[PDB]
Amino acid sequence: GLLGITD
């Protein structure tokens, strides 16, 4: 989820 990156 962080900046849309994986988590």
XYZ file of N, CA and C in Angstrom:
21
model
N 0.794 -1.221 0.000
C 0.000 0.000 0.000
C 0.819 1.259 0.000
N 2.071 1.188 0.463
C 2.910 2.385 0.549
C 3.160 2.843 -0.874
N 2.662 4.019 -1.210
C 2.758 4.566 -2.579
C 2.206 3.554 -3.634
N 1.314 2.685 -3.183
C 0.733 1.691 -4.052
C 1.684 0.514 -4.313
N 2.834 0.466 -3.658
C 3.818 -0.571 -3.910
C 3.582 -1.753 -2.973
N 3.019 -2.807 -3.512
C 2.777 -4.081 -2.785
C 1.879 -4.032 -1.539
N 2.324 -3.427 -0.443
C 1.576 -3.360 0.813
C 0.665 -2.147 0.933
